Structures are given as C-alpha cells and as structure tokens.
Amino acid sequence: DDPILQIAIDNSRNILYTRSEKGVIQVYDLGQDGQGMSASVSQNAIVSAAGNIARTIDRSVFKIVQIAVI
Numbered sequence: 001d002d003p004i005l006q007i008a009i010d011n012s013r014n015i016l017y018t019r020s021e022k023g024v025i026q027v028y029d030l031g032q033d034g035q036g037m038s039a040s041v042s043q044n045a046i047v048s049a050a051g052n053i054a055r056t057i058d059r060s061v062f063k064i065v066q067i068a069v070i
Contacts, residue, residue, distance in 0.1 A: 010069035023064045 001020025008017040009030075016028040016035060024042045028035035043062050050057060 006067060008067055008069050012069075015069070017067055017069060019064060019067050023062065025064070025067060 001022035001024050003021045004018045005021050006019040008019070009015070010017065014030045016030050018026045018028075018038075020026075024040050026038040026040050028037035043059065046057060046062070047054065047059075055061075
C-alpha cells in the first residue's frame with residue numbers, strides 16, 4: 001500500500017509493524033543498522049491461513065481495523 005495508516009511498535013522484541021490503507025502489514029526487525037524486512041501479511045495470506053473457516057473474512061468484507069503487538 002499506498003499509505004501507512006498506522007504504525008505500531010513491539011517494545012519487547014524491537015519489532016516494527018506498519019499497516020497500510022490497503023490492509024497489508026509489514027513487520028520490520030528494528031536493528032541498530034536499520035530496518036530489516038519487508039515480510040508481509042495480506043488478505044491472501046490470511047485466506048491461506050484459515051484453511052478451515054471463512055466468510056466474515058471474505059474478500060469484499062475483508063478490511064484491517066487495527067493491529068496490536070503482543
């Protein structure tokens with residue numbers, strides 16, 4: 001995506017997360033020499049992920065409201 005709607009930081013693991021308008025997530029490893037990445041989760045990844053349940057996570061319906069680091 002296009003813009004980065006939200007930014008989140010995992011304090012415990014020094015990991016950066018970015019959520020874009022489109023709903024793609026990117027998690028950079030924060031290192032002394034810079035950011036290392038960027039792995040991504042997308043709607044496609046999620047679909048593959050469920051592999052057992054689906055509907056609310058429909059393509060049309062699918063959108064991400066918020067992301068929180070654990």
